[PDB]
Design a protein around this nucleic acid. Structure first.
Ligand code: UPC
Ligand code: MG
Ligand code: MG
Ligand code: MG
Ligand code: MG
Ligand code: MG
Length: 901
DNA sequence: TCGAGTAAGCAGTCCGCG
DNA sequence: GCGGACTGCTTAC
């Protein structure tokens, strides 16, 4: 096989690299890498190296990496640009792996671990590590085994060995229900003291050194805990055995208000799964505890135990160890579904970076562009300092608040990367400027044509047309990867709907799910077999289709996030290619494009309908338009349609055959107007929305910008078995809204859009009557909690104290002097409840850590003093009032002259 | 919340508004 | 009571 790196580090004048060799074996080497950097030279000086602008450069070969760094400093002292890749390990990878890396994941050691630490005096601080580590479960991907290190003797209790037989048993048998598929994969090691446990763990770590290290909060908790505990017990040199090069650094992570410490293990790539999840999942969760996330992702029940975790080991060591094992497996189960590790490896190897650098689009793109330029013997510019400056972004159209019955939407494929490619926006393609007219003049095509030579953006910028910039070239490559994976995702989605249809009429038989590839549209043969399958088999197929869809989503959305990150990176001062001319060229062209196509679609629809000056486009945001199709529907008349699917087909056909050619003609004219390199403004039909045929549903509504709901029947080629609500921005979509309230508001919306006013009034009346029975957690608001100290004046709210911070302070007084009570963590999330006047807590609300039951110290007092009235008005009624007045509807029945009967 | 960007919505505090 | 100035939080894109 072709070789590939595992990890790379610079340590002084040496590169330390772990890698897989041509025979598929892991090796390590130390290389005295001689880096090169560059300086501009005279024209007369013969060279093959040129900066991105075509100015000649001489290569400076250094005796070592420290000489190279020192040279960069002196060039600053002199006042001269020092060109080239200043991160030497990135240049090393480029030289050493001068080809597209093809990696084999089966050779990469991926370690997933979790530790347990009993603590009677509060949260065990990883920087202190004053309490014994009493359990470690460490899954190794190469062995496919869970290694369990169990501490039997501790100052906090001596315990008996853990029993695998009881672990496997049902909870209804007094067992722990450790999943049977991992039982044979557990290698259990009890220890009589902590020192033996830790020395054996380090010997194990030496034999099976992680390349990729993950788990849940491993970077902020487990890794610093283990390191500092070992350091405390044995000293530094032993703790540094966690690094294969025996080098570690304490790293300070600084935020807006405060800072924390982590431990960098040189030669390991730590990818904390909580952080992978936050970056790649595109959710915002009320809580990030593993139980919460696991439940959300897998629909697995919460790990039940009695008492606090701090007394769990001594009261039920059996369950304690089982739950530590299950904790490790849950992260693996999430990964099987989300595939964020696979993603990270793909992106990391593509860019040629340390895999942990995937968290940084700036680092990722710097590497990609460096490698691309290096191939043409071009030399990257030095990074420079820039003051942060605000700059303009997208246009969002102000919608008229209303119900909207029939709606069709259109959206530009990868808007910003497409603009980059079309305009040829790049650091080295800047050709000059032209005199700018007001944006509205370009939108209405009355402004003077910017250029007859160069490709233009309405911000005043001009770009070369003879050759693609490096930014268009490289953004294109990742876009095509994105496009491929989106294809698989959509095919999996469409296949899902086929399965859902067949489920309505399943066969009464015993059989098996079909062996198929859900990334491709089902053949007719497959479709026929599907109609003859059982519910059991169909549901299993649905699950597999949906997993395939998720695999596709992960791959596509995060490649889109990567290319969109490059457009944003041009407006970040730390990016090597920061330039506000280029960032604003993108965003200003986007504004023009949207408003241009708005005018074109309006002009076209007025023409087909025979009207004049009427607004068909009701809304748009960044790169989308929402088109009212009432008039298109009315032109044939609702009476002509057999069923809902009939008018959906008609609208689908009208968009593809009439509107999209008009849209394409409109954008081609704009392309020529701007003299752009390549026409790439492609505005695919997204949604077809309206009420069920013959119903009293309203179809959709807007309340304002970025706030709307639609009853969708078809989403870019996916025809739904059951209509799907597309709700954007409304309270049903905010993590701050109580769970039960999200659900109730969504049903209210479903009824509005599908069934009409009376149905909505029926549901509201019922919800208002029963809601006080709802579980307190389901009706608690959620908020992030920053700057708790700032608003704390002697345990009481200071001036301008936010409502949720007020709640935390109320909580803090109520649990004061309890080092056992759960503490609210600065920067994390809390549940929030209003409290009735005259409550014993002495304030109008209380807050407690999100994802958890409130401590039994105060629970039933909270339940007794909950202000359901305020809770209802604030979270449910006020938002519902917003929805209904926008939609010109009433949630409560108005009195009629009929009432006199 | 270490980690590409801007636009913009709503909750809440403080305080004017004769 | 509402709304503007403001902070805080969250979402759409
Ligand atoms: O996090 C973001 C989201 C969007 N955009 C900018 C850049 C985006 O290009 C633009 C529009 O965003 P969408 O329409 O939502 C996604 P796109 O158009 O890229 O790709 P498809 O529509 O799925 O094909 O807004 C960003 O700069 N950052
Ligand atoms: Mg645990
Ligand atoms: Mg788009
Ligand atoms: Mg699309
Ligand atoms: Mg069937
Ligand atoms: Mg969009």
């Amino acid at each position: 096989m072709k070789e590939f790196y595992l990890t790379v580090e610079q340590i002084g004048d040496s590169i330390f690299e772990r890698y897989i060799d041509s025979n598929g074996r892991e090796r390590t080497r130390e290389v005295e890498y001689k880096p090169s950097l560059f300086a501009h030279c005279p024209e007369s000086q013969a060279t093959k190296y040129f900066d991105i602008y075509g100015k000649p450069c001489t290569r400076k070969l250094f005796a070592n990496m420290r000489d190279a760094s020192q040279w960069i400093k002196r060039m600053e002292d002199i006042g001269l640009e020092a060109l080239g890749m200043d991160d030497f390990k990135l240049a090393y990878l480029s030289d050493t792996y001068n080809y597209e890396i093809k990696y084999d994941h089966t050779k990469i050691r991926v370690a997933n671990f979790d530790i347990e630490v009993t603590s009677p005096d509060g949260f065990p601080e990883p920087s202190q590590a004053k309490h014994p580590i009493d359990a470690i479960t460490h899954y190794d991907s190469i062995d496919d085994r869970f290694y369990v290190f169990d501490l039997l003797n501790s100052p906090y209790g001596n315990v008996e060995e853990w029993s695998i037989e009881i672990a496997a048993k049902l909870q209804e048998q007094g067992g722990d229900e450790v999943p049977s598929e991992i039982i044979d994969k557990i290698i259990y090691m009890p220890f009589d003291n902590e020192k033996e446990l830790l020395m054996e763990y380090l010997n194990f770590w030496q034999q099976k050194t992680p390349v990729i290290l993950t788990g849940w909060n491993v970077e902020s908790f487990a890794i610093p805990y283990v390191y500092n505990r070992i350091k405390n017990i044995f000293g530094e040199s032993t703790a540094k055995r966690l690094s294969p090069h025996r080098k570690t650094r304490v790293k300070v992570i600084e935020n807006m208000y405060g800072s924390r410490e982590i431990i960098t293990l040189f030669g390991i790539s730590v990818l904390d799964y909580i952080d992978l999840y936050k970056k790649f999942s595109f959710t915002n969760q009320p809580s990030y505890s593993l139980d919460y996330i696991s439940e959300f992702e897998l629909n697995v029940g919460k790990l039940k135990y009695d008492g606090p975790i701090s007394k769990l080991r001594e009261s039920n060591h059996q369950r304690y160890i089982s739950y530590n094992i299950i904790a490790v497996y849950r992260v693996l189960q999430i990964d099987a579904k989300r595939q964020f590790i696979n993603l990270s490896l793909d992106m990391g190897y593509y860019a040629k970076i340390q895999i942990q650098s995937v968290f940084s689009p700036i680092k990722t793109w710097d590497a990609i562009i460096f490698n691309s330029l290096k191939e043409q013997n071009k030399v990257i510019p030095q990074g420079r300092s820039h003051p942060v400056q605000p700059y303009p972004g997208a246009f969002v159209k102000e919608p008229i608040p209303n119900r909207y019955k029939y709606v069709m939407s259109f959206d530009l494929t990868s808007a910003y990367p497409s603009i980059i490619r079309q305009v040829n926006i790049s650091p080295e393609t800047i050709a000059g400027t032209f005199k700018v007219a007001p944006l509205h003049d370009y939108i209405n095509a009355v402004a003077e044509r910017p250029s007859d030579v160069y490709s233009c953006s309405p911000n005043g910028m001009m770009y070369y047309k003879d050759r693609d910039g490096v930014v268009p070239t490289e953004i294109t490559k990742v876009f095509n990867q994105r496009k491929e994976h989106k294809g698989y995702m959509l095919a999996a989605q469409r296949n899902g709907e086929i399965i859902k249809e067949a489920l309505h009429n399943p066969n009464l038989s015993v059989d098996e799910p079909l062996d198929v590839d859900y990334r491709f549209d089902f053949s007719d043969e497959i479709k026929e077999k599907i109609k003859k399958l059982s519910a059991k088999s169909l549901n299993e197929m649905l699950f597999r289709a949906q997993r395939t869809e998720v695999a596709g989503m992960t791959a596509q959305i995060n490649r889109k996030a990567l290319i969109n990150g490059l457009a944003g990176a041009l407006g970040n001062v730390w990016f090597r290619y920061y330039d506000l001319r280029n960032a604003t060229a993108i965003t200003t062209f986007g504004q023009m494009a949207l408003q241009w196509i708005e005018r074109k679609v309006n002009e076209y629809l007025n023409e087909v309908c025979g009207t004049e000056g009427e607004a068909f486009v009701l809304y748009g945001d960044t790169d989308s338009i929402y088109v009212s199709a009432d008039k298109i529907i009315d032109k044939v008349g609702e009476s002509k349609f057999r069923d809902t699917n009939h008018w959906v087909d008609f609208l689908d056909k009208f968009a593809r055959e009439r509107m999209e050619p008009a849209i394409d003609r409109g954008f081609r004219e704009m392309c020529e107007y701007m003299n752009n390199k390549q026409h790439l403004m492609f505005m695919d039909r997204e949604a077809i929305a309206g009420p069920p045929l013959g119903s009293k549903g309203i179809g959709g509504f807007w309340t304002g910008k970025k706030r709307y709901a639609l009853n969708v029947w078809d989403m870019e080629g996916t025809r739904y078995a059951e209509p799907k609500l597309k709700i954007m921005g409304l309270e049903t979509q905010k993590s701050s809204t109580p769970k039960a309230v999200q659900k109730a508001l969504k049903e209210c919306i479903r009824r509005m859009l599908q069934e009409g006013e009376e149905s909505l009034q029926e549901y509201f009346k019922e919800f208002e009557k029963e809601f006080r029975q709802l579980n307190y957690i389901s009706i608690a608001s959620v908020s992030s909690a920053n700057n708790i100290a700032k608003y704390d004046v002697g345990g009481f709210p200071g001036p301008k104290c936010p409502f949720h911070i007020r709640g935390i302070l109320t909580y803090n007084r109520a649990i004061k002097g309890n080092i056992d009570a759960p503490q609210v963590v600065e920067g994390e999330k809390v549940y929030v409840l209003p409290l009735r006047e005259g409550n014993p807590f002495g304030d109008k609300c209380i807050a407690w850590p999100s994802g958890t039951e409130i401590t039994d110290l105060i629970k039933d007092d909270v339940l007794h003093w909950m202000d359901y009235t305020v809770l209802l008005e604030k979270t449910f009624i006020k938002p519902l009032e917003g929805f209904t007045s926008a939609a010109k509807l009433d949630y409560e029945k108005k009195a009629s002259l009929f009432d006199m009967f």
